[PDB]
Amino acid sequence: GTAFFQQQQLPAAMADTFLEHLCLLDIDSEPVAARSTSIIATIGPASRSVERLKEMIKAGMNIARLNFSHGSHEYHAESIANVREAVESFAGSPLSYRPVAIALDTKGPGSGPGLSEQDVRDLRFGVEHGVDIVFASFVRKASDVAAVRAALGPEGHGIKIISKIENHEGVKRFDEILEVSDGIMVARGDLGIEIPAEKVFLAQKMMIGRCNLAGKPVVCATQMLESMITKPRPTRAETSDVANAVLDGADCIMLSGETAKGNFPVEAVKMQHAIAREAEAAVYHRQLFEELRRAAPLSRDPTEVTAIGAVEAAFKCCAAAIIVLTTTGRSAQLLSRYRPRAAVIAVTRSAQAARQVHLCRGVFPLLYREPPEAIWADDVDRRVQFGIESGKLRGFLRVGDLVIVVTGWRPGSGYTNIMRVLSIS
Amino acid sequence: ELGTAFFQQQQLPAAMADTFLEHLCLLDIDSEPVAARSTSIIATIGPASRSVERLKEMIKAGMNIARLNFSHGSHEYHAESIANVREAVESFAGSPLSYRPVAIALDTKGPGSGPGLSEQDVRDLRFGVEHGVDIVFASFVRKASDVAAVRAALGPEGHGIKIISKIENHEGVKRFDEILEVSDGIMVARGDLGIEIPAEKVFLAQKMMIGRCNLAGKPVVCATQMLESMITKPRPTRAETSDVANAVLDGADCIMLSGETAKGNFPVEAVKMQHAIAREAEAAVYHRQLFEELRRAAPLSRDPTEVTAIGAVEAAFKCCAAAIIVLTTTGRSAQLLSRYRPRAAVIAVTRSAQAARQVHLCRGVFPLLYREPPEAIWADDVDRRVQFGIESGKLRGFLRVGDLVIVVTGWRPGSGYTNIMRVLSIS
Amino acid sequence: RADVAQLTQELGTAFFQQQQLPAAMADTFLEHLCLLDIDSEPVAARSTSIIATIGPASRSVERLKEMIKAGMNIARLNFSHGSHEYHAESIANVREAVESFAGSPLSYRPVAIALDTKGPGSGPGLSEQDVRDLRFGVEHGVDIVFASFVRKASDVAAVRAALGPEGHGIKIISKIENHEGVKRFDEILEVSDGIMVARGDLGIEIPAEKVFLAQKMMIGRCNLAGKPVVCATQMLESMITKPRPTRAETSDVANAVLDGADCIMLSGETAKGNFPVEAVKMQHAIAREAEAAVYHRQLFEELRRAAPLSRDPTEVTAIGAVEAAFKCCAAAIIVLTTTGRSAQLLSRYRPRAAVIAVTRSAQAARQVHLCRGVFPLLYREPPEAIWADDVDRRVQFGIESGKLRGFLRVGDLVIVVTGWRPGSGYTNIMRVLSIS
Amino acid sequence: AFFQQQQLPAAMADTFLEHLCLLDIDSEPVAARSTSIIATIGPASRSVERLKEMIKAGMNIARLNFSHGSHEYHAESIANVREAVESFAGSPLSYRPVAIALDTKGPGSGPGLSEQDVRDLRFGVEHGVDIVFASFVRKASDVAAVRAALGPEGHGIKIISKIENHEGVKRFDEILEVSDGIMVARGDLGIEIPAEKVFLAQKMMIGRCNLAGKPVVCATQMLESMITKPRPTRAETSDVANAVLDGADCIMLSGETAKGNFPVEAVKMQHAIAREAEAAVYHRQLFEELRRAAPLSRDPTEVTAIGAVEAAFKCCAAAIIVLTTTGRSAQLLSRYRPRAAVIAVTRSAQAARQVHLCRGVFPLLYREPPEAIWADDVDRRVQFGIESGKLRGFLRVGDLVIVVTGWRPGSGYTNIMRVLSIS
Ligand SMILES: CN(C)c1ccc(S(=O)(=O)N2CCN(S(=O)(=O)c3ccc(O)c(O)c3)CC2)c2nonc12
Ligand SMILES: CN(C)c1ccc(S(=O)(=O)N2CCN(S(=O)(=O)c3ccc(O)c(O)c3)CC2)c2nonc12
Ligand SMILES: O=P(O)(O)OC[C@H]1O[C@](O)(COP(=O)(O)O)[C@@H](O)[C@@H]1O
Ligand SMILES: O=P(O)(O)OC[C@H]1O[C@](O)(COP(=O)(O)O)[C@@H](O)[C@@H]1O
Ligand SMILES: O=P(O)(O)OC[C@H]1O[C@](O)(COP(=O)(O)O)[C@@H](O)[C@@H]1O
Ligand SMILES: O=P(O)(O)OC[C@H]1O[C@](O)(COP(=O)(O)O)[C@@H](O)[C@@H]1O
Ligand SMILES: O=C([O-])C(=O)[O-]
Ligand SMILES: O=C([O-])C(=O)[O-]
Ligand SMILES: O=C([O-])C(=O)[O-]
Ligand SMILES: O=C([O-])C(=O)[O-]
Ligand SMILES: [K+]
Ligand SMILES: [K+]
Ligand SMILES: [K+]
Ligand SMILES: [K+]
Ligand SMILES: [Mg+2]
Ligand SMILES: [Mg+2]
Ligand SMILES: [Mg+2]
Ligand SMILES: [Mg+2]
């Protein structure tokens, strides 16, 4: 229908140049796709109550950040318990349950050369409390990431380490840091004090670009909606900043004081949700997909090969979604690196993977709770139907839509190799 | 994992270039072709190429389609030619490394002075149906109704025969779109075309028709005087080798030999020359731009076969896949893969002898006729044909242990349900 | 590398490390982003003009001199506040600060004066106060009118009529502040000299989360049309009270420049804030960084692909001159202009080279600040008897002022754009000159 | 009607595939033929009357094959060419200069320059030849030996290196660096390397020469069958069209004109095909790729050339009129493959003959009286290019032209591009 092609900036998406794409952007072309950039909300006195946390989950919070620069272990354990209580209050409806990751943001090295003794204690607390992600403060070199990894020990091998780049050395040694990290956070607060303020946008754009090229999550952080700490509406520079972080290629956008101590924590989440949805429809996928395809090296890994074939197939038919079965989240991450317009619905039995895939733009995790079927092919089909039923309930899919389904040839992580075109009935 | 030698062969330095100009600059006469020859060779059967022994040599040299020119000879003469082709083809049933299907094409005499289908073309088309020909090269197609007349003449039994319309005059060129729409493919019949329009304009008609056929995903044949001097000489001129290479680089699915094989002194050598040039020219194709342009020009599709095909070709390029193995009954799944011009060979596994012969019209499709009895469990039968394609691939040199192959199948039996693409590691 | 090797040996590796030149040579936009370097220092003069709103914090002659030195190019008078007497005093103080630097072209900086109207209010068209204020603008020789709440072409015809026969030279920049203005954008741009994305009202008239779409669409259409576009409101809002902006504010200024804005504006930051000079310095610092980060390879190709073929020799010369400037990494394009139009056509192709515009019109020298990358030089030397000698003298004046100001160096290549006969509209010549 | 001719619908296409789809056999070529025709002079084309017909048919360069015939035979050929060329000097606005190229016998089994090549090269200098087609060039030192044998009097002669064997192809870059241009000598090349690989060598060499901005000639068996038949084969017309589409500056005729029964018809056939093939060139991609690949430059002639070609495409300029002493300014314009004709106005007779090596350069030998004021003299040569262009069909009143001149007399000072309206 004609109406389909008038929505989600589809006239601007069909443009032959980026300049023409900009000219065709329409404030009346409503976004239809689900919001794909994750919202990280920092937990504090304004967002700690179980009832307030339920409102924030409904508004769109995907990751709960615990800032270990403030508060004791007792304070953070209570925050964790309140987050988990608010998250599990929706578990009664498995088709609409939304997993929420828990990220521990470290205090940092301070004047010392490497890992502080408080960071070692806080990291062990994170492992003991089952945190999903570590936002490692002031990472300056690859050995800083290795020290964080060693402090997590053998039980914390599954925790994702997102390195915070906050100073000149971190920016200069970026490639070596990204190589050993699971992702990056552009920590603009400290970065804007360590380097000239007028240069922070160059560091942000460079880091987002390099993370997109590497296929690793990148978080844009600090003062995105600062004025909303005390005011109900953000400034014109703030909405522009959020939209441009998404247009730059950020996987995640963050709220610090806006949710930790502000008067509008839920409204700050709703604002980031609204801007991100508008900005994602304004992404010029024609150039972005071509450039990601061109920049990506040849690969003999079947997951990587299946992912690009599936994204190409999704664009060919305007698939509403790519439904992927994943154990670690990796198959969903490799799909996400090609920035499909289709939602990546990731069906998993791992509660930790369902939480961690929020780091990857466009990945919508579904936690499947049923015990495995005796016949593995039936177990596989049941999970794909779970992804379809949740997708229909949430508005991702309708009858008549085409979906791309991504599976593997045997159970266990690392064997994704199949892509199939499916019609929604 | 593959080695530096792998990336020096088959013009891979030129293939990785960022511009077409740089691609040309990187072409290397020392970069040897490794991939199997993907552009089919059509050889016209005549007095110089009719004997069963000569036909065996032509099959070994690379002939994929045997052309019977109904402008010369009687039905009895052509039936004997057909029987000799089939005898030469079946002489390799004892060697899997050599049994290759060969299509039989009937080239019509034409309408002559008359308006539509001639009495003789009607009788000759009937002969083709009765003798089980795979393809009709319809002479002097001028409009869509000419194709409908040929199609109507393919009686109740011959609706599966492919109609390749020969464009040989100004009207055929001008009404090209309407002709291509109702035809299975096109032949740029340069002999008559070069007499009907100014000779210096034929290259424009050839390039335009090949481009439109590539955009439509329909077979296009480049024909006439490609290696003309080889009718009396053992080596072609510099213009002739250039012409064969440029037909492949233009986007032709097939290249043809007429007098060179029908009446010449070197029919086998003419086939060998076309084989050698096509292999070199296929490695020199600038896939980076070709794939992007085919992708961009092709419209969005809700047909799972079309969606699977582009996903599979994208996957093949990503891993330098040795091959795309496709299960096909009509050949359609192999044809949709072929339209995206993959560098990987498209190994088409079919139980249909006719589809095996007819897929020679599509560039890069290597048919394998499968004759094992069907399995009770369908998924087992699918696995069996996939493994058959892998093992013939290994036997013929297409594949080795450790290679990656893309596999295209459907979710249920019967034609029309292709929707699956898998990445398999060769064990 | 081979496409920049001889010039790398000639100019040196240090030349190609500065002004984001490694990012500028990238083959894709993604690679361009990856190559952005915080240590790659900007070298070129700031090309995006800064409009500063004059008010109690920025009205004194001494403060205005500091703002001109900080980088203010256009002084905005907001007619929503203050009397005609108040604005006439503001104008006189701006002119006094401007003329305090008039001893030489090396120190002189023309500053345009823009009148921002109160607006229609609840009424359908031009208010009686707007008619009076527009007549005040003509009488006080304002260069630009920022017309508030333009909703259709007839609104700009009414502003043009209220300016009368004496105000035909005044540039009308239409402020788009509501849904109707955005929807009827093409008809408004057609009859306007330029556009202002007035984000303050726009953010209240349409959903706040959609303002960035309106800004990017309007900047893109203005760039395609070759008309000035101003990005306005809350760019450095926090600097009204604080000496440093927030991370969203520096990002907003940089992104307005990267979007393609010709001008960036300061309202409360300079009119009533505690740090008006620091707000100007911050915009100057960010614009210089953002201009070097522009991906000229794609921008120039897209401006060429989107622009229709032209039989206007000024338009043909402009693209040839910009192409020539990119081929040799020209330090400047020196153009002779009566109305500013030849400099504007050069500016639409977004050259990396500075466009030094030599003119005798004081008004054109002020108004060309609306065009990104145009540096106006007001020529006051006595005329030559022979027209060809007079042209050559103005070209040499451009080169001398360029050299003494740091824009040009001995050894540089400069592109010179002139016409074949006197009078506006005859530009048709492009010359490649080596600086000695 | 303007946009229906010269494949302009195909020229406006957004992809090369769409460009091919839009090629129209009814879209007539209107631009003058840009690719020069080199015709080999022999028994079938030696008479002054025959040579006049070949000049009218389109011959731009006369090739003397020193593998056959004596010095007396070649001197007579040269004199007959010059007599046929000067028979048209009565109409200066339509006079066509014709270059004379000497094709050497070659080294044979020898390591360097043979004694016959030294004698033949000295003959060329003494008879004022414009170009040397140096046979079997295998390395840069082979070009240096040819250059030394030409001596101080043969400084101005262009050396076009013939690549005819494996070594020449492998050492191509070093050969091109010291040569004025290249000839893809397909006859010997097709015997020295496998025949099925010659097209790879041709396309690589044409591409590298286009990148370097140096003339490249496609040679041998282009219309071979026309030695005995009045019409060529379908492979032959395709070969001529593809050499032009590949980017060749010149196309050659050997036996077709030297000994064949239809030398004039062979020239007419190459002219007709080249005109059709030049209109089918996809300039949108070609200009962008040549523009992207041409390195950054601080040479004002180079900078003016790109500005002028960009300006010509922006206004659909009928021509770029350039003033040149050595031909260099016209060559730098030619390397960007403008659709506009490059009308090169020169006082040098040798430069007018030699610029035939550069595709799209139409030489005008200026023989009008000088003007006292240099500025007036320049403007007069510009009007001469405009009137010659008007007479020859190139230009009409109302057209736009780009004019490329310098700031002072003498070679090497081009730095000005101007947009001029015709009449
Ligand atoms: C995530 N990441 C790598 C990307 C972001 C945005 C894009 S994008 O949104 O497609 N876009 C961005 C800006 N331009 S531009 O060349 O600077 C230009 C061109 C014309 C103008 O008028 C203008 O103001 C600026 C490049 C393309 C991408 N494409 O590929 N990758 C893209
Ligand atoms: C199969 N069939 C449809 C096609 C053939 C070749 C190609 S192609 O190989 O990608 N194609 C070759 C011709 N050039 S060009 O513009 O003539 C050019 C440009 C720059 C130069 O320096 C030059 O000498 C020539 C465009 C690129 C195709 N692409 O899409 N479809 C293609
Ligand atoms: O993305 P990951 O972590 O590699 O997991 C993908 C895996 O999920 C599957 O699709 C299903 O596996 P399970 O039955 O063990 O859940 C596997 O075939 C595949 O290897
Ligand atoms: O190319 P075609 O004619 O559509 O055939 C493709 C068909 O082949 C298959 O892959 C295998 O089917 P069969 O077992 O019936 O041969 C189908 O699942 C698919 O529909
Ligand atoms: O940019 P504008 O307004 O068209 O003015 C450009 C004009 O300036 C000139 O270069 C010099 O003209 P003047 O001598 O009148 O100042 C003209 O040749 C040209 O037409
Ligand atoms: O192309 P070339 O050999 O460098 O010659 C270009 C030269 O021609 C001119 O335009 C005219 O010079 P002359 O008056 O000597 O003929 C010079 O200004 C310029 O330097
Ligand atoms: O730590 C942070 O998030 C910062 O400094 O921006
Ligand atoms: O019939 C043919 O093949 C022809 O005419 O070229
Ligand atoms: O009027 C203004 O400048 C605005 O609303 O931004
Ligand atoms: O000498 C030649 O021209 C050849 O060998 O082709
Ligand atoms: K912290
Ligand atoms: K026939
Ligand atoms: K106002
Ligand atoms: K010779
Ligand atoms: Mg910090
Ligand atoms: Mg025929
Ligand atoms: Mg307002
Ligand atoms: Mg030879």
Residue C402 and residue C408 in contact, taking contact as beta carbons nearer than 8 Å = yes
Tell me how crowded residue C423 is: count the other CB atoms within 10 A of its CB.
Answer: 7
Q: Spell out which residues have Cβ within 5 A of ligand 15, the ion.
A: A 166, 187, 190
Residue D103 alpha carbon to ligand 14 centre in Å:
5
- C-chain CB neighbours of D376 within 8 Å are none
The letter for the amino acid at B362 is C
Q: Is the dihedral of CA C157, C160, C162, C165 positive or negative?
A: negative
Q: DSSP per residue over A326-346, as a string?
A: -SSSHHHHHHHTT--SSEEEE
Question: B156 to each of B126, B130, B151, B330, C89, how far by Cα in Å?
Answer: 10, 11, 10, 18, 97
Residue D64 alpha carbon to ligand 10 centre in Å:
12
User: Would the CB of D324 count as within 6 Å of ligand 6?
Assistant: yes
> How far apart, in whole angstroms, are the C-alpha atoms of residue A330 and residue A325?
10
Residue C327 and residue C300 in contact, taking contact as beta carbons nearer than 8 Å = no
Residue D53 and residue D84 in contact, taking contact as beta carbons nearer than 8 Å = no
- B-chain CB neighbours of A309 within 8 Å are 311-312, 314-315, 318, 406, 421, 423
Residue A119 and residue A108 in contact, taking contact as beta carbons nearer than 8 Å = yes
Residue A115 alpha carbon to ligand 7 centre in Å:
17
> How far apart, in whole angstroms, are the C-alpha atoms of residue C115 and residue C129?
13
Residue C251 and residue C231 in contact, taking contact as beta carbons nearer than 8 Å = no
Cβ distance A298 to B320 less than 8 Å, yes or no, reads yes
- A327 contact partners, CB below 8 Å, separation of at least 6: A348, A349, A350, A353, A412, A413
Residue B386 alpha carbon to ligand 4 centre in Å:
12
Cβ distance D199 to B224 less than 8 Å, yes or no, reads no
**Among A293, A322, A420, which would you mutate to test the B interface (most chain B Cβ atoms within 10 Å of its Cβ)?**
A420
Cβ distance B423 to A290 less than 8 Å, yes or no, reads no
User: Would the CB of D381 count as within 6 Å of ligand 6?
Assistant: no
- Closest chain D residue to C318 measured between Cα atoms? D311
Beta bridge partners, B255, equal: B41, B222
Q: Nearest-CA distance from C139 to chain D in Å?
A: 41
> How far apart, in whole angstroms, are the C-alpha atoms of residue D359 and residue D327?
12
> How far apart, in whole angstroms, are the C-alpha atoms of residue C426 and residue C207?
47
- Closest chain D residue to B278 measured between Cα atoms? D196
Residue D60 and residue D356 in contact, taking contact as beta carbons nearer than 8 Å = yes
Residue B181 alpha carbon to ligand 14 centre in Å:
52
Residue of B217, B211, B160, B226 lying closest to B185 (CA atoms): B217
Residue D139 CA to its chain's centroid (Å): 24
- What token pair was written down for A207? 């880091």
CA atoms within 13 A on the CB side of C158: 22
> How far apart, in whole angstroms, are the C-alpha atoms of residue A41 and residue A257?
9
> How far apart, in whole angstroms, are the C-alpha atoms of residue B187 and residue B206?
9
Q: Is the dihedral of CA C385, C391, C394, C395 positive or negative?
A: negative
Cβ distance A402 to B302 less than 8 Å, yes or no, reads yes
Q: Which of B1, B310, B419 minimises the CB distance to A316?
A: B310
- Closest chain D residue to C416 measured between Cα atoms? D416
Beta bridge partners, B221, equal: B187, B254
Where does D213-326 have alpha helices with state H?
Answer: 234-246, 255-258, 263-279, 283-293, 300-315
Residue of D247, D342, D340 lying closest to D293 (CA atoms): D247
Residue of C98, D192, B379, C302 lying closest to A287 (CA atoms): C302
Tell me how crowded residue B50 is: count the other CB atoms within 10 A of its CB.
Answer: 16
Residue B320 and residue B3 in contact, taking contact as beta carbons nearer than 8 Å = no
Residue of D269, D272, D23 lying closest to B207 (CA atoms): D23
Angle at Cα B415 formed by Cα B412 and Cα B418, nearest 5°? 60
Tell me how crowded residue A277 is: count the other CB atoms within 10 A of its CB.
Answer: 21
Specify the ligand 6 atom closest to the Cα of D413.
Answer: 20
Q: DSSP per residue over B152-207, as a string?
A: HHTTTT-TTSEEEEEE-SHHHHHTHHHHHHHSSEEEEEHHHHHHHS-GGGHHHHHH
Residue D104 alpha carbon to ligand 18 centre in Å:
9
Beta bridge partners, D159, equal: D132
CA atoms within 13 A on the CB side of B202: 33
The letter for the amino acid at D249 is D
> How far apart, in whole angstroms, are the C-alpha atoms of residue A384 and residue A380?
6
Question: A330 to each of A145, A182, A304, A411, how far by Cα in Å?
Answer: 20, 11, 10, 15
- What token pair was written down for C235? 């760019």
Q: Which chains touch C (3+ CB pairs under 8 A)?
A: A, D
Residue of A352, A353, A349, A387 lying closest to A370 (CA atoms): A349
Strand A160-165, strand A183-187: pairing: parallel
User: Would the CB of B304 count as within 6 Å of ligand 4?
Assistant: no
DSSP three-state, residue A64: strand
Where does C140-235 have alpha helices with state H?
Answer: 153-163, 179-183, 185-191, 199-205, 211-225
Report which secondary-structure segment, H or E, holds A422. strand A416-423
Residue of D158, D33, D166 lying closest to D101 (CA atoms): D158
Cβ distance C328 to D293 less than 8 Å, yes or no, reads no
Residue B163 and residue B187 in contact, taking contact as beta carbons nearer than 8 Å = no
Residue A291 and residue A340 in contact, taking contact as beta carbons nearer than 8 Å = no
Q: DSSP per residue over D341-407, as a string?
A: EEEEEES-HHHHHHGGGSTTEEEEE--SPPPSSHHHHHHHHHHHHHHHHHHHTS--TT-EEEEEEES
Q: Where are the beta strands (DSSP E) in A23-73?
A: 38-42, 61-67
DSSP three-state, residue B412: coil
> How far apart, in whole angstroms, are the C-alpha atoms of residue C317 and residue C323?
10
Q: Where are the beta strands (DSSP E) in A90-196?
A: 101-105, 133-136, 160-165, 183-187
* Residue D213 backbone dihedrals phi, psi, to 5 degrees: 70, 30
Per 3-state DSSP, chain D is made up of helix, strand and coil in percentages (nearest 5) of 45, 15, 35
- Terminal Cα distance for chain D, rounded: 22
Q: Nearest-CA distance from C71 to chain A in Å?
A: 16
Q: Which of D300, D311, D402 minimises the CB distance to C432?
A: D300
Residue C215 alpha carbon to ligand 9 centre in Å:
13
CA atoms within 13 A on the CB side of A226: 19
User: Would the CB of C336 count as within 6 Å of ligand 5?
Assistant: yes
Cβ distance C29 to A287 less than 8 Å, yes or no, reads yes
Cα-Cα-Cα-Cα dihedral of A413, A415, A417, A423, to 10°? -40
- What token pair was written down for B306? 């079309």
Residue of C69, C24, C15, C11 lying closest to C294 (CA atoms): C24
Q: DSSP per residue over A341-361, as a string?
A: SSEEEEEES-HHHHHHGGGST
- A-chain CB neighbours of C221 within 8 Å are 23
* Residue A133 backbone dihedrals phi, psi, to 5 degrees: -135, 150
Residue D39 and residue D257 in contact, taking contact as beta carbons nearer than 8 Å = yes
Tell me the structure's resolution in angstroms, rounded to a single decimal: 2.0
Residue B213 and residue B251 in contact, taking contact as beta carbons nearer than 8 Å = yes
DSSP three-state, residue B143: coil
> How far apart, in whole angstroms, are the C-alpha atoms of residue C227 and residue C370?
9
Cβ distance A236 to C252 less than 8 Å, yes or no, reads yes
**Among A19, A168, A275, which would you mutate to test the C interface (most chain C Cβ atoms within 10 Å of its Cβ)?**
A19
Experimental technique used to determine this entry: X-ray
DSSP three-state, residue B322: coil
Cβ distance A192 to C247 less than 8 Å, yes or no, reads yes
Q: DSSP per residue over C249-277, as a string?
A: HHHHHHHHHHHT-SEEEESHHHHT-S-HH
The letter for the amino acid at C20 is Q
Burial class (CB in 10 A: 0-12, 13-18, 19+), C373: buried
Residue of A55, A112, A65, A121 lying closest to A87 (CA atoms): A55
Question: B225 to each of B204, B256, C41, D196, how far by Cα in Å?
Answer: 17, 9, 64, 17
Residue nearest to atom 12 of ligand 4 (CA): B413
Beta bridge partners, B345, equal: B323
**Domains, chain D, ranges and CATH?**
33-277 (3.20.20.60), 283-421 (3.40.1380.20)
Q: Nearest-CA distance from A307 to chain B in Å?
A: 8
DSSP character for A215?
T
> How far apart, in whole angstroms, are the C-alpha atoms of residue D296 and residue D311?
18
**A408-412 contact pairs (CB < 8 A, 24+):** A408/A325, A408/A331, A409/B422, A411/A376, A412/A327
Cβ distance A419 to B311 less than 8 Å, yes or no, reads yes
Question: D260 to each of C291, D228, D245, D263, how far by Cα in Å?
Answer: 65, 6, 26, 6
**Residue to mutate, B192, B197, B206, ligand 8, most ligand atoms under 8 Å from C-beta:** B192
Residue D7 and residue D24 in contact, taking contact as beta carbons nearer than 8 Å = yes
> How far apart, in whole angstroms, are the C-alpha atoms of residue B187 and residue B201?
16
- What token pair was written down for C77? 């008078």
Residue of C66, C142, C59, C70 lying closest to C100 (CA atoms): C66
- A92 contact partners, CB below 8 Å, separation of at least 6: none
- What token pair was written down for C49? 């003009």
CB-based pocket (< 6 A), ligand 1 = A 18-19, 22, 209, 212, 247, 249, 284, 287-288, 291; C 29-30, 33, 220, 223, 259-260, 295, 298-299, 302
Residue nearest to atom 1 of ligand 8 (CA): B189
DSSP character for A412?
S
Specify the ligand 9 atom closest to the Cα of C204.
Answer: 5
Strand B418-425, strand B404-410: pairing: antiparallel
Where does D87-195 have alpha helices with state H?
Answer: 115-126, 140-150, 166-170, 172-178, 186-192
Tell me how crowded residue D369 is: count the other CB atoms within 10 A of its CB.
Answer: 6
Residues C38-65 as b or e (16 or more Cβ within 10 Å = b): bebebebebbbbbbbbbbebbbeeebbb
Strands of A343-348's sheet in order across:
A363-367, A343-348, A321-325, A402-408, A416-423, B418-425, B404-410, B323-327, B345-350, B365-369
Beta bridge partners, D62, equal: D39, D100
- What token pair was written down for D220? 């041998």
Cβ distance C327 to D297 less than 8 Å, yes or no, reads yes
CB-based pocket (< 6 A), ligand 7 = A 164, 166, 187-190, 221-222
* Residue A85 backbone dihedrals phi, psi, to 5 degrees: -65, -45
Residue A189 alpha carbon to ligand 7 centre in Å:
5
**Among D177, D403, D417, D421, which would you mutate to test the C interface (most chain C Cβ atoms within 10 Å of its Cβ)?**
D417
User: Would the CB of B215 count as within 6 Å of ligand 2?
Assistant: no
Q: Is the dihedral of CA D179, D185, D188, D192 positive or negative?
A: positive
- A10 contact partners, CB below 8 Å, separation of at least 6: A4, A29
> How far apart, in whole angstroms, are the C-alpha atoms of residue B223 and residue B127?
24
